[PDB]
Structure 1
Amino acid sequence: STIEEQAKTFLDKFNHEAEDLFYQSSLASWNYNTNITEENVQNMNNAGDKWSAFLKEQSTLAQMYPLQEIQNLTVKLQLQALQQNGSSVLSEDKSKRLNTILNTMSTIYSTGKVCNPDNPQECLLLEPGLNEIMANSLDYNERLWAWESWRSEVGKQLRPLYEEYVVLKNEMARANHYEDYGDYWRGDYEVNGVDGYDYSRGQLIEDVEHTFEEIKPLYEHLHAYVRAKLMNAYPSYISPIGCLPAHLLGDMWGRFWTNLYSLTVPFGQKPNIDVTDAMVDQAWDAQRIFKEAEKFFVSVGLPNMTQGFWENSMLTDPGNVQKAVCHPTAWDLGKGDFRILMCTKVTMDDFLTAHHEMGHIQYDMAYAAQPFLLRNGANEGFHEAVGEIMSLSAATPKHLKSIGLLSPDFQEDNETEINFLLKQALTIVGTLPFTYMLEKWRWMVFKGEIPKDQWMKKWWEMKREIVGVVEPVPHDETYCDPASLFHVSNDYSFIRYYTRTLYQFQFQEALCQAAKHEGPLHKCDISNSTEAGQKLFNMLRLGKSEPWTLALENVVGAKNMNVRPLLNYFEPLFTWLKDQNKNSFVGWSTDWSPYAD
């Protein structure tokens, strides 16, 4: 008779129906990604629309069960996502045009290309074509031609499409009783219903701002180290107290600095750790790469992989007859069906990638006992963070000497470890200011604090303050930098990259303290230690059924994000960068411009 009995009955039947259609919807996308056919493209749209319209029909009966009469926490969380009507709150005209803008911006990004200024006949697409050239290009003009001319036909063309994207998504949050669309992505961290563990949505703005303050002294020493290496090439354009050009960051948007690791090597007289040449002599194939990584999950106490996982894996691309996407992705269908689509070659990166791709599958096995509505990560940052901490322990020299990749006589000292910590810093340390910059810019534009004319005015102004990057050619309001980005144009969460770095280092420090490892943190290895896997398995099976602030306390003992593991793991590198930057100026100024002298 109570509402709780009626709400639980609706959730018991919905978990079965939603799980059956989601499996066929994910299976249709699997057959389309592994094989390109005219039958699979129609099955993906058919099975995709049946599952999409299924949540819309069940949302009508979900709003008829108020959460005020439900005293159960697990019931209100299952009805939290079903209470939202999605795009049904928008008007019929705005709902149909919303999917059009998303499909148009995604098509222009895929079909966009920049023709060679020297060769007007040859026109190369961005991915892979332009993304590959910008990596190894050392030329000043060649990098500027691809970087500047892209946003001319893309950033300027997507501006009227981006203006409509802001207006349509703001009307959805207003009907959902949200302050703005920027608050919608902050609702994933929302926690209510438990005394003392409540987490406000507006708290994330102060959290990412306060944790970034302690990141500055670590980032300023690394930014000055990279600038000192590239100063001798162009001393006129690159000022010691100034900022680095935007096109020289190693790729189009400057997401990762790993492309610059070649010229930034502190010591070139010492060998580097590489497992590529070691796997060639051992003669290993794609079958034993996942097999050796499966034993890594057994040594920590985690269950092994099912027979259907290794049998259904796709280990290569059979030519152009049957084409599959080589971008590594872990696809979770349902009911114990786990598959991964990746093109596996023999490289040092594919070894660490195998631990990352199998980390998502191993992560899904813990909470798989939960209902379909309760199967998910506690937030958007925990998805990729679980797979990264598995690869960090594999990249250590201790784990490489265990299975025989690295020779046991290899000398491990400060000169070898500082070279390894610098490669990870370019991917990690360089990501945090860039992710905090673009995400905070979206929150300010979606809120309305920045007029449409000041989008680019505040973009490059706040860019020299955060990441210390100035544009070689000044741009007007016609260009839009985030419009060309993969995550913004495809409507994917851009905040998950900033919080992931803080979550993965907390887990790295906690697991090494449980297994009683001594010394620096980058020397830690979680293999053969079953004590750390038991403490982590308790949180992995919770998912989002419990508050992420409560599940985080059961591992690291912290109720929020903390920079202490970020500084300690980078402490050996921070001490070396401080001594090398004494001859240079630590920090940068925002008043310097390459075209303003």
Structure 2
Amino acid sequence: SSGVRLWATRQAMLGQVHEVPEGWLIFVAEQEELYVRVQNGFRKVQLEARTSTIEEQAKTFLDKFNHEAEDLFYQSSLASWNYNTNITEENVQNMNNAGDKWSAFLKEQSTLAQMYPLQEIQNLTVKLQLQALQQNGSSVLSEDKSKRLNTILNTMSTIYSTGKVCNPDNPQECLLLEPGLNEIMANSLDYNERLWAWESWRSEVGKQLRPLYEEYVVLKNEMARANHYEDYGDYWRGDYEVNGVDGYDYSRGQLIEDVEHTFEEIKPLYEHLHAYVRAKLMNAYPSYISPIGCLPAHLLGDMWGRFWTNLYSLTVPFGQKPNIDVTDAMVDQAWDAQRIFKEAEKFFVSVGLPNMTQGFWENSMLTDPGNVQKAVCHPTAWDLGKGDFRILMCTKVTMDDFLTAHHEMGHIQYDMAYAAQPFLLRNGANEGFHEAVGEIMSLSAATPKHLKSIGLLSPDFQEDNETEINFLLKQALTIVGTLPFTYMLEKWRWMVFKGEIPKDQWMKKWWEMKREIVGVVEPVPHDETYCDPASLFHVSNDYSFIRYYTRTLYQFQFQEALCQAAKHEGPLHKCDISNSTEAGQKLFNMLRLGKSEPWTLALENVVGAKNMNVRPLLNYFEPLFTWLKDQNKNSFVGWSTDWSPYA
């Protein structure tokens, strides 16, 4: 013993001096002060002034790769932005060529990185970067298995994107999922029209995708075994996995544990929320919604019941008190996309974050990019590299565009935060961190205190409890509404990749937890021909939906840390972090690392805990929970799986 016992600050040393054993060096990492642990305290130690292995070759190989990678990635990034801004055939070709150049280049380095054995490589950053490169992808399988898996992904993504259903009343009248079916599942309130749209989408897509999905899963599973995973779920569980880090290693199975462990705390709030929606639905559809039965899968505000936000019309806590809107004030104050972005930039400056790049304005587009060029209006950030930061969207004078602008800007702030890190580390620690950071900025941007501070919300405006309940429930519909849907679906892919559910029970098991975990009942029964669990975008397009679940746990914890940092006074849903420079600095310390460090370390450095939890959400919706329990003390609370609209 009597070795190196080093920590960050002297305050840690004062609290841990009794912990440090006799003879152990007390080195303060931040203060660069060295002390020796002696009898009842520490003594000052004299310090002087600050001054071919394969691992050395790997460092040369890795850095050399970066310079090539930076250039080629920029070409692919630019080709994408040009194609995204203007969808033309020429824009496609360069995107293909740059992507083909980029993809081919990466595998050569991937194979070359695999030539380096990581066991003899001890640098934490270097070893992580190499394995981040040594990943061979689908090439770990055979080419034909890679060919099948990729082509199916091309087809499955195409089928979901091109999934179009036709009503039996008119064969020629066919409506896509968007905007045809989704508007019907959200805006239309007809029992049959929503039932048909829900049924037809899962019929013409699920039946076609089910054979493709069956082969897709095993292809994804066998590569996971080829990549040393129990299933492709564990392959996606390796994304949050932390290995080799003392005090921060995160096992893949722990991801399943934490998601289920945190989900059980959401059930009581959700159950009363589920009962209240059932209580409100039975006020609108008493026949279609039983007081004890589950909520029909076609009356949930969207195709799959993913979000209950569109049910706010039928489940409004207080019709006389609408949600706080300052979009008209923006119209009154003549605010527009550049103004909103400038206000967002000012808000980011308000929390101490640096002002965003001016080159963004020259390069990125905010409003609708006309019609000659073809572009997507969805909020999309663009960290093209080499200091090139952009956001591609059509921003109008609306809160949603205002909030998503904050959501997208936070990504860019995160993008430049880890831009100092190498290209391999130039990304978020996990898939949900950047999105979670984007959300909390929008949430703070949506705070009425911020709106009142900036003048969007008038000073004489009052935030009554009914409005807060209206706000919280709308938050619950958006956030807590999708949590059970996210929890089961990701867990569904977990067991499907693990093969727990046999082919002849994928649909039956889906409806088993639909009515039980989520309390959602299919209006008409579906069999294994249907592939409704894969009918969503992420499952069809092979995206781990856990990102939404993880970020929601992260964002509330981060916001809770923000509220603690900003010293919020009031309801947690009213927590505004405006004019809180220190919180941005603390957030910057997390964001500056990006993915250079384990996400558990970053999570603890912000919220104080190395594990995600839903404790802020319970605090966030605590007044709402009491109101929901008060509203549900009369109506039945829970859900009966046996009941169904078809029986």
- TM-score normalised according to structure 1 size: 0.97
Q: For the residues of structure 1 that align with 2:167 and 2:154, how far apart are their CA atoms?
A: 27
Q: For the residues of structure 1 that align with 2:463 and 2:564, how far apart are their CA atoms?
A: 23
User: CA offsets, 1:176-229, max 9 Å, x none?
Assistant: 121121110000111112222221111111111111111111111100001011
Q: For the residues of structure 2 that align with 1:271 and 1:36, how far apart are their CA atoms?
A: 40
Match of 1:507 in 2: 558
In terms of mean alpha carbon deviation, does 448-457 or 129-138 score higher? 129-138
In terms of mean alpha carbon deviation, does 113-122 or 347-356 score higher? 113-122
- What is the deviation of 1:45? 0.7
Match of 1:591 in 2: 642
Out of 77, 80, 83, the position equivalent to 2:131 is 80
Q: For the residues of structure 1 that align with 2:462 and 2:166, how far apart are their CA atoms?
A: 48
User: CA offsets, 1:68-117, max 9 Å, x none?
Assistant: 11221111110111122112111122122222111111222222211233
5+ residue gaps, structure 1, are none
Q: For the residues of structure 2 that align with 1:586 and 1:129, how far apart are their CA atoms?
A: 34
C-alpha change, 1:300 and 1:577, in structure 2 (3 Å) is same
- Within a 5 Å distance, the mapping from 1:221-370 to structure 2 comes to 221-370=272-421
User: CA offsets, 1:283-338, max 9 Å, x none?
Assistant: 22222111111001111111111110112121233443212111111121101101
Q: For the residues of structure 1 that align with 2:231 and 2:326, how far apart are their CA atoms?
A: 49
Contact 1:338–1:361 at 8 Å: present in 2 too?
yes
- What is the deviation of 1:589? 2.1
Secondary structure of residue in 2 paired with 1:114:
strand
Q: For the residues of structure 2 that align with 1:152 and 1:546, how far apart are their CA atoms?
A: 45
What percent of counterpart residues are identical? 100
User: CA offsets, 1:444-483, max 9 Å, x none?
Assistant: 1111221110111111012111110111211111110133
Q: For the residues of structure 2 that align with 1:509 and 1:483, how far apart are their CA atoms?
A: 34
- What is the deviation of 1:232? 2.9
C-alpha change, 1:433 and 1:271, in structure 2 (3 Å) is closer
- What is the deviation of 1:484? 2.0
Secondary structure of residue in 1 paired with 2:305:
coil
Q: For the residues of structure 2 that align with 1:375 and 1:220, how far apart are their CA atoms?
A: 41
Secondary structure of residue in 1 paired with 2:335:
coil
C-alpha change, 1:167 and 1:515, in structure 2 (3 Å) is closer
Secondary structure of residue in 2 paired with 1:189:
coil
C-alpha change, 1:520 and 1:547, in structure 2 (3 Å) is same
Q: For the residues of structure 2 that align with 1:521 and 1:145, how far apart are their CA atoms?
A: 40
Q: For the residues of structure 1 that align with 2:64 and 2:247, how far apart are their CA atoms?
A: 33
Q: For the residues of structure 1 that align with 2:645 and 2:160, how far apart are their CA atoms?
A: 29
Contact 2:83–2:91 at 8 Å: present in 1 too?
yes
- What is the deviation of 1:14? 0.8
C-alpha change, 1:150 and 1:524, in structure 2 (3 Å) is closer
Q: For the residues of structure 2 that align with 1:81 and 1:542, how far apart are their CA atoms?
A: 16
User: CA offsets, 1:148-170, max 9 Å, x none?
Assistant: 11222211011111111012112
Out of 127, 130, 140, the position equivalent to 2:178 is 127
- What is the deviation of 1:271? 4.6
- TM-score normalised according to structure 2 size: 0.90
Q: For the residues of structure 1 that align with 2:218 and 2:332, how far apart are their CA atoms?
A: 58
Contact 1:224–1:585 at 8 Å: present in 2 too?
yes
In terms of mean alpha carbon deviation, does 313-322 or 246-255 score higher? 313-322
The answer to whether 1:188 aligns with 2:188 is: no
User: CA offsets, 1:509-553, max 9 Å, x none?
Assistant: 112222323222222211112121121111111111111111222
Q: For the residues of structure 2 that align with 1:194 and 1:483, how far apart are their CA atoms?
A: 35
In terms of mean alpha carbon deviation, does 517-526 or 467-476 score higher? 517-526
In terms of mean alpha carbon deviation, does 205-214 or 281-290 score higher? 281-290
Q: For the residues of structure 2 that align with 1:522 and 1:586, how far apart are their CA atoms?
A: 25
- What is the deviation of 1:402? 1.6
Contact 1:221–1:587 at 8 Å: present in 2 too?
yes
Contact 1:317–1:323 at 8 Å: present in 2 too?
no
Contact 1:25–1:51 at 8 Å: present in 2 too?
yes
- What is the deviation of 1:121? 2.6
Match of 1:170 in 2: 221
In terms of mean alpha carbon deviation, does 102-111 or 387-396 score higher? 102-111
Q: For the residues of structure 2 that align with 1:324 and 1:556, how far apart are their CA atoms?
A: 38
User: CA offsets, 1:555-591, max 9 Å, x none?
Assistant: 1110101221111111111111111111112212223
User: CA offsets, 1:346-372, max 9 Å, x none?
Assistant: 222111111111111111121111110
In terms of mean alpha carbon deviation, does 58-67 or 123-132 score higher? 123-132
Q: For the residues of structure 2 that align with 1:271 and 1:392, how far apart are their CA atoms?
A: 18
Match of 1:498 in 2: 549
- What is the deviation of 1:233? 3.2
Q: For the residues of structure 2 that align with 1:72 and 1:66, how far apart are their CA atoms?
A: 13
Q: For the residues of structure 1 that align with 2:201 and 2:320, how far apart are their CA atoms?
A: 39
C-alpha change, 1:415 and 1:232, in structure 2 (3 Å) is closer
- What is the deviation of 1:58? 1.0
C-alpha change, 1:447 and 1:245, in structure 2 (3 Å) is same
In terms of mean alpha carbon deviation, does 47-56 or 525-534 score higher? 525-534
Q: For the residues of structure 1 that align with 2:534 and 2:439, how far apart are their CA atoms?
A: 28
User: CA offsets, 1:408-455, max 9 Å, x none?
Assistant: 101122122111111111011111111111111111111122111011
Contact 1:63–1:83 at 8 Å: present in 2 too?
yes
In terms of mean alpha carbon deviation, does 449-458 or 227-236 score higher? 227-236
C-alpha change, 1:526 and 1:135, in structure 2 (3 Å) is same
Out of 469, 473, 489, the position equivalent to 1:422 is 473
Secondary structure of residue in 2 paired with 1:158:
helix
Contact 2:184–2:193 at 8 Å: present in 1 too?
no
Secondary structure of residue in 2 paired with 1:339:
strand
Secondary structure of residue in 2 paired with 1:124:
strand
Q: For the residues of structure 2 that align with 1:593 and 1:67, how far apart are their CA atoms?
A: 55
- What is the deviation of 1:245? 0.4
Contact 1:468–1:588 at 8 Å: present in 2 too?
yes
In terms of mean alpha carbon deviation, does 58-67 or 107-116 score higher? 107-116
C-alpha change, 1:116 and 1:168, in structure 2 (3 Å) is same
In terms of mean alpha carbon deviation, does 340-349 or 510-519 score higher? 510-519
In terms of mean alpha carbon deviation, does 379-388 or 173-182 score higher? 173-182
- What is the deviation of 1:376? 0.9
- What is the deviation of 1:44? 0.7
Contact 2:185–2:300 at 8 Å: present in 1 too?
no
- How many corresponding residue pairs? 596
Contact 1:182–1:447 at 8 Å: present in 2 too?
yes
- What is the deviation of 1:277? 1.6
In terms of mean alpha carbon deviation, does 231-240 or 397-406 score higher? 231-240
Q: For the residues of structure 2 that align with 1:330 and 1:573, how far apart are their CA atoms?
A: 33
Q: For the residues of structure 2 that align with 1:253 and 1:293, how far apart are their CA atoms?
A: 33
Q: For the residues of structure 2 that align with 1:344 and 1:63, how far apart are their CA atoms?
A: 45
C-alpha change, 1:173 and 1:249, in structure 2 (3 Å) is same
Match of 1:44 in 2: 95
In terms of mean alpha carbon deviation, does 509-518 or 47-56 score higher? 509-518
Q: For the residues of structure 1 that align with 2:226 and 2:631, how far apart are their CA atoms?
A: 55
C-alpha change, 1:31 and 1:366, in structure 2 (3 Å) is same
- What is the deviation of 1:120? 2.7
Contact 1:470–1:593 at 8 Å: present in 2 too?
yes
- What is the deviation of 1:235? 2.4
Greater relative contact order (CA < 8 Å, ≥ 6 in sequence): 1
Contact 2:163–2:205 at 8 Å: present in 1 too?
yes
Contact 1:381–1:496 at 8 Å: present in 2 too?
yes
Contact 2:410–2:434 at 8 Å: present in 1 too?
no
Contact 1:111–1:125 at 8 Å: present in 2 too?
yes
5+ residue gaps, structure 2, are 1-51
The answer to whether 1:14 aligns with 2:100 is: no
- What is the deviation of 1:263? 2.2
In terms of mean alpha carbon deviation, does 124-133 or 573-582 score higher? 124-133
- What is the deviation of 1:144? 1.1
